[PDB]
């Protein structure tokens, strides 16, 4: 029932399995930017060690593709960031996820909904492909200064792709 989609990256295959029921607002958005070939050549721009990888958001040089109006924040769906999930990532308002996403490498409580945070909405997890993400989150990154954690070698989503169900 849940949608797969394979993500075909330089460093490796990660495939991913949508929550549908629990996430609906950010699984169809997800797949609408799936769907169109937005992620095509898209990088993961940020990675911190054995903790999460983070893209969605630009080409191979750093130009931010313009995304699709946002999305409701589903974090209040009850599921966790723990590792091998992925989630949405936005910016101060609630509100404010676009197409960047982030894959958790470590379970991270910081990340979850509570009485005081909003928190990022988690939409499904990775079923393949786990040591692909391990190992894109321990590449070389540049140091300090504004590409602090950007990888020093681009790693790029080269498809992304929904599978048959």
């Known amino acids: 029932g849940d949608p797969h989609v394979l993500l075909t990256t330089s460093a490796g295959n990660i495939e991913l399995e949508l929550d549908s029921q629990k996430a ?22 940020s990675v911190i060690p054995g903790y999460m990888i983070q893209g969605g958001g630009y080409t191979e040089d750093m130009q931010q593709k313009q995304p699709n109006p946002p999305i409701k924040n589903e974090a209040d769906n009850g ?15 609630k509100d404010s996820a676009t197409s960047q996403f982030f894959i958790n490498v470590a379970d991270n409580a910081y990340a979850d909904h509570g009485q005081t945070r909003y928190g990022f909405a988690v ?9 692909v993400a391990d190992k894109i989150s321990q590449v070389p990154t540049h140091d300090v200064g504004p590409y602090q954690s950007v990888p ?7 498809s992304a792709t929904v599978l048959p169900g």
């Open 24 to 45: 609906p607002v950010s699984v169809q958005n997800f797949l609408d930017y799936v769907n169109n070939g937005f992620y095509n050549n898209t990088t993961f721009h």
């Open 79 to 93: 599921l966790r960031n723990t590792r091998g999930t992925i989630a949405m990532m936005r910016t101060e308002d």
């Open 123 to 131: 939409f499904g997890k990775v079923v393949k492909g786990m040591d």
């Open 152 to 158: 020093s070698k681009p790693v790029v989503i080269l």
